[PDB]
Amino acid sequence: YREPVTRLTKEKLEWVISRRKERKAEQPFGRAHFPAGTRAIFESCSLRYLDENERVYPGQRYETFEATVLGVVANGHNSYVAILDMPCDLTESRNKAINVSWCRGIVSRGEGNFTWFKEESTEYDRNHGWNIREKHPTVRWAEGPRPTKVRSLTWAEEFDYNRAVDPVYIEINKHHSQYYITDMRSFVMFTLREHPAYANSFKDHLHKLDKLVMALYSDPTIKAAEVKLSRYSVSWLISKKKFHKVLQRLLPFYKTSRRKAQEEDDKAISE
Amino acid sequence: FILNAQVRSDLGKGASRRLRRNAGLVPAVVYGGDKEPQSVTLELREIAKLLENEAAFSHVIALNVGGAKETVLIKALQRHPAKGFVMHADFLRVVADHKLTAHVPLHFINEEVAVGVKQAGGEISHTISEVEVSCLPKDLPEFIEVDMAKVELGQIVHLSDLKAPKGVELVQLAHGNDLAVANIHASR
Amino acid sequence: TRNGRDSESKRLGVKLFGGQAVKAGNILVRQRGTKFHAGYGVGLGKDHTLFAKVDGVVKFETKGAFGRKYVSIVAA
Amino acid sequence: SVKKETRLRRARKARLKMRELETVRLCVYRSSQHIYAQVIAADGGKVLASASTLDKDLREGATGNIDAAKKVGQLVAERAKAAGVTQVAFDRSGFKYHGRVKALADAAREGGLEF
Amino acid sequence: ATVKVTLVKSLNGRLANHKACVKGLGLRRINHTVEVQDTPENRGMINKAYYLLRVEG
Amino acid sequence: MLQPKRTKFRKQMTGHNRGLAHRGSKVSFGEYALKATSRGRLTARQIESARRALTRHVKRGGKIWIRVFPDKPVTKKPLEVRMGKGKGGVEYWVAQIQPGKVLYEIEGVSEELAREAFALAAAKLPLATSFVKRT
RNA sequence: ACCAAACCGAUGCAAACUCCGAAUACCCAGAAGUGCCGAGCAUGGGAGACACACGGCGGGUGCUAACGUCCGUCGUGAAA
RNA sequence: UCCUAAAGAGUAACGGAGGAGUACGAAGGUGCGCUCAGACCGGUCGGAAAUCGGUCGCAGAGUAUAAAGGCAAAAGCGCG
RNA sequence: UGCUUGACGAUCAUAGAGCGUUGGAACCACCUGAUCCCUUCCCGAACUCAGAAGUGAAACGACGCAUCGCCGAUGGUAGUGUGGGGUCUCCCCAUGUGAGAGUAGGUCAUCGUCAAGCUC
Numbered sequence A: 001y002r003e004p005v006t007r008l009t010k011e012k013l014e015w016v017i018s019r020r021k022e023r024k025a026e027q028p029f030g031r032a033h034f035p036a037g038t039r040a041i042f043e044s045c046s047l048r049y050l051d052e053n054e055r056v057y058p059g060q061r062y063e064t065f066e067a068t069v070l071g072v073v074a075n076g077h078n079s080y081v082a083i084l085d086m087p088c089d090l091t092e093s094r095n096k097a098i099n100v101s102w103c104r105g106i107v108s109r110g111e112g113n114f115t116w117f118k119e120e121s122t123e124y125d126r127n128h129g130w131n132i133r134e135k136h137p138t139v140r141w142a143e144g145p146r147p148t149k150v151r152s153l154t155w156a157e158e159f160d161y162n163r164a165v166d167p168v169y170i171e172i173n174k175h176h177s178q179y180y181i182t183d184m185r186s187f188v189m190f191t192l193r194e195h196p197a198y199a200n201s202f203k204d205h206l207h208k209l210d211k212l213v214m215a216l217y218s219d220p221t222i223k224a225a226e227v228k229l230s231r232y233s234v235s236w237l238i239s240k241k242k243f244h245k246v247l248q249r250l251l252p253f254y255k256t257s258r259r260k261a262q263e264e265d266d267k268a269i270s271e
Numbered sequence B: 001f002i003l004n005a006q007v008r009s010d011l012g013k014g015a016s017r018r019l020r021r022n023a024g025l026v027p028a029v030v031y032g033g034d035k036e037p038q039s040v041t042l043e044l045r046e047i048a049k050l051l052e053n054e055a056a057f058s059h060v061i062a063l064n065v066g067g068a069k070e071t072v073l074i075k076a077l078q079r080h081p082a083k084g085f086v087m088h089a090d091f092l093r094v095v096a097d098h099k100l101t102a103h104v105p106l107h108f109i110n111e112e113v114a115v116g117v118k119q120a121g122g123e124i125s126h127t128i129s130e131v132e133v134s135c136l137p138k139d140l141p142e143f144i145e146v147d148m149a150k151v152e153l154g155q156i157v158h159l160s161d162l163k164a165p166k167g168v169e170l171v172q173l174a175h176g177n178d179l180a181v182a183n184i185h186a187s188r
Numbered sequence C: 001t002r003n004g005r006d007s008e009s010k011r012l013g014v015k016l017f018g019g020q021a022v023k024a025g026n027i028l029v030r031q032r033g034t035k036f037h038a039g040y041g042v043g044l045g046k047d048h049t050l051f052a053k054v055d056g057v058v059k060f061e062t063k064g065a066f067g068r069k070y071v072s073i074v075a076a
Numbered sequence D: 001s002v003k004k005e006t007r008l009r010r011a012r013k014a015r016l017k018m019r020e021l022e023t024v025r026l027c028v029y030r031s032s033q034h035i036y037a038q039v040i041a042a043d044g045g046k047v048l049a050s051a052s053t054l055d056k057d058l059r060e061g062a063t064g065n066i067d068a069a070k071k072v073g074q075l076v077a078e079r080a081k082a083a084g085v086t087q088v089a090f091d092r093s094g095f096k097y098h099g100r101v102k103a104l105a106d107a108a109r110e111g112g113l114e115f
Numbered sequence E: 001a002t003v004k005v006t007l008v009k010s011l012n013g014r015l016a017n018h019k020a021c022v023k024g025l026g027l028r029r030i031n032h033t034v035e036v037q038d039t040p041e042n043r044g045m046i047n048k049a050y051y052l053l054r055v056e057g
Numbered sequence F: 001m002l003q004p005k006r007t008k009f010r011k012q013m014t015g016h017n018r019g020l021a022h023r024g025s026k027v028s029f030g031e032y033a034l035k036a037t038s039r040g041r042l043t044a045r046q047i048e049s050a051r052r053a054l055t056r057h058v059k060r061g062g063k064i065w066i067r068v069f070p071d072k073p074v075t076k077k078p079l080e081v082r083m084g085k086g087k088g089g090v091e092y093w094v095a096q097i098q099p100g101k102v103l104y105e106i107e108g109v110s111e112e113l114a115r116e117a118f119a120l121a122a123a124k125l126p127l128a129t130s131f132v133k134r135t
Numbered sequence G: 001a002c003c004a005a006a007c008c009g010a011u012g013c014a015a016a017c018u019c020c021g022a023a024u025a026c027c028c029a030g031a032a033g034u035g036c037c038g039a040g041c042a043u044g045g046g047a048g049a050c051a052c053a054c055g056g057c058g059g060g061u062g063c064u065a066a067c068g069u070c071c072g073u074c075g076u077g078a079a080a
Numbered sequence H: 001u002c003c004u005a006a007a008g009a010g011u012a013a014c015g016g017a018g019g020a021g022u023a024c025g026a027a028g029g030u031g032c033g034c035u036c037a038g039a040c041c042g043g044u045c046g047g048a049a050a051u052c053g054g055u056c057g058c059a060g061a062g063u064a065u066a067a068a069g070g071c072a073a074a075a076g077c078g079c080g
Numbered sequence I: 001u002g003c004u005u006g007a008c009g010a011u012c013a014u015a016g017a018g019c020g021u022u023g024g025a026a027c028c029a030c031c032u033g034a035u036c037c038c039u040u041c042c043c044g045a046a047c048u049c050a051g052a053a054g055u056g057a058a059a060c061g062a063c064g065c066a067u068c069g070c071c072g073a074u075g076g077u078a079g080u081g082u083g084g085g086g087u088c089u090c091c092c093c094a095u096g097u098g099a100g101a102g103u104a105g106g107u108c109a110u111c112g113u114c115a116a117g118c119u120c
């Protein structure tokens, strides 16, 4: 006997060790083992199948069924569900979605690595595309001369935003080697999912998007790039190369454990 | 040592060049520890007197941007090479407790009567000047006194010879080097 | 003593930049000593000539150690 | 050390050629006491099946023998076939393919799994 | 809204690019006023040919 | 006169002399210096003529630094030779000077003795040179 | 009492030197309008040309001389 | 082969600098194993240096052949 | 919902170099003699084999400590597309773009899958 070195309580340590060993034993497969076309057996829940007194796989409580997987999608930070070709799902869903933890075995593996199933695009996805963002500067024209350069409001907002003959807005283009950004969070979210340089890198990693955006705000380069064009919003006019350099420099330091994020989500929804 | 400034809410090359010929101003920045950098305009005449002052470089200078007052130290001077005149300053804020590296001139106060001068051939060459410094702003070394009245002919003065008084360190001595300061040799 | 005798300009360079669509056996880069290394779906033939093997879009990404340039083609 | 980075230097040739070929890799890690074995997908960073001696059903104090490695190579094939994994490549991980590594490889073939 | 441009310079000594930008805007000769939709790519040619045009609003 | 002991190549292009002198415009060793406020180039004999003028007006001590070193060889075809039969041989070496460049430095002398010595030095050069102090 | 590798510090210069590095120029994809009503491509009939000159911006040679000579890129004349 | 050649190709001069009109039956193919140059200390006739041991190295060596571009999956070295 | 450790990876100096205390619970080499395979341009250290009679430091393993290296702002400057000028081998103006170097300072990195140990 040696005293375990842990900050957790004794009973909590027992529970953690027991759950870890049970997860390793009862659930020996993950998202890795399911390329497209892979035939796998899945142990469904008590619904639609009978409880069995005689069980063959480790910790099998229900009957299994053999089927083929099209891919895998993520229903959580560390939780993944496999998409099958059978359409029932005990509902009107076009394809079933079952947690990969329910898998008990695989008979044949499809070619290639595990395939991320491409769910059908929703109108929300089309409306919230990367290119749907505002493209060029939109400045107000309250005084006489027509604006030709993009400038901050510079306290014109503070003393006069209610009295005006009309709030004429003129669209002014920017230099081709710059980005115009209205929402930093949305721009950095659509980026790292659709940009080519950052497209397929983060399938395995989870990034702290909010912390990354706050750090990007704290970076004095983007601070210099800030331009105030409206009263209650801040837009950025930053060179493409500078933005990409800053993003590449800051990004790898803002990764977090998927398991910890999943546990935080579980404790949040449970409470 | 006192100086008033402005905001300079206009950046770039043409905007920076128009200030020098039209208004005779000089841009600048105020970057520090706990605050963001702030661009600043200044008058060439006002900077000229401070530059003409001897110990103005190694001294805390109050800066009046608007009504805002701040203790500002100068540790940079961009200067036009061809004609010769001050360009944008790039001076630094002074926090009450910070290491605050800067540059300090030398004087070589006592060289009228020296051993190598009066006894042997008399020549004194000041190899280095504007020695760096690293000390808190609570005590400002305006200058460092060097005495060469006892150094004989053929001897040289290292950085370790002269002393940095009252809690002042030398970055060059923190490095693995000890530079010569002055020499006494024979005239050709 | 006398020095003329120039060479005939082998027509090197890089074709099919990183926003293109490539066929099975297109020539990507005419190179001279591996300025760019073999990415995912390129071959690096006899004279270090990068050529595609599958269809996709050229990438031009820097990967791995030594700061080497890799020319990969992405099926997108 | 001197040995560790030398064997890593030796292994990386085949370990990178298999990555280019996009083949499921059967890695191995020999020790002075007991041998491991892993099956890794065609991305270099994802393990599909793995049989080792330190499980709670094979540690008996006799590990570190050619006979012990035969059992590991036998019991890795059943877990590989449980994942439906065939058409794999054998990465010796810089170890000279003469002894216990060869026995593990032969037991992998005897276990139904084929390269 | 729209913006009217007026050609106030000749096209007979200019580059092959600005001479194409003016034609793309749709101007045929000097003192010729046309209405163009003030799109981000229509006013981009006005920037290239700013010295040939009188943007009178 | 001053020239490299050995050179990687024998002849060089004509080139151009654009821009100011941002490096070399600060006095480093001496206390007084003679910087050039006009663009041009020195031919490696003007440097010697100015050096011998500065080193004979003091005649007591001080120290002299030659900041500019000629390293650009220039060609010159001989007379009665038609153009286009190769490239001429190297006759002399040239230093390229652009505004702000410091040419000479002096220390250990009076603030006015050096001023009237650099007056002698400037008369031997084709450039309009000003007098600057250490800072 | 000369000289002197090596190392440290300060300080300058290279078309055939780079720890770096633009602006422009180039390619590919998506769009509104314009194109004198077509701008592109391919197959055929007919050709003419293959001594070029000067101006601006970048270079080689020349003496960063020549309305000098050879190039890259635009304009004019040639042919207004 | 480099520059001139102006950060896609190309681009002239009786413009600046260099080489080729071959070699290998292993100097090719495969499997398995190993580091280079250079500095210092010690070690008998060698001595700044030959062959040997150790450390510091972190490719500043080497490429069959001129220069340019690459070579720790070494494209360099040895054995069947 | 912890700590330790092995394997393969994401990314390649903000991930590196250098400076202590340490790990017995599996590995990590070391070791008995090299008998049985295998090995030495000669060597049981490289390589291999029967483990653990021994060993926890040299060795490595992570785990402390910001001198060096690396990263690097803002601002200005150099340069430059378009148009017009001057004292036109060079520079200026309007507009757009805009380096390199230097300049407060962070860091003993941040993550993915499998496997094992500590409590039971």
Ligand SMILES: [Mg+2]
Residues within 6 Å of the ligand: D010, D013
């Ligand atoms: Mg090898």
Ligand SMILES: [Mg+2]
Residues within 6 Å of the ligand: none
């Ligand atoms: Mg015409």
Ligand SMILES: [Mg+2]
Residues within 6 Å of the ligand: none
């Ligand atoms: Mg160059």
Ligand SMILES: [Mg+2]
Residues within 6 Å of the ligand: G050
């Ligand atoms: Mg002809």
Ligand SMILES: [Mg+2]
Residues within 6 Å of the ligand: none
């Ligand atoms: Mg002809």
Ligand SMILES: [Mg+2]
Residues within 6 Å of the ligand: none
């Ligand atoms: Mg002519």
Ligand SMILES: [Mg+2]
Residues within 6 Å of the ligand: none
């Ligand atoms: Mg004719």
Ligand SMILES: [Mg+2]
Residues within 6 Å of the ligand: none
């Ligand atoms: Mg070219």
Ligand SMILES: [Mg+2]
Residues within 6 Å of the ligand: H006
């Ligand atoms: Mg070009």
Ligand SMILES: [Mg+2]
Residues within 6 Å of the ligand: none
């Ligand atoms: Mg060879």
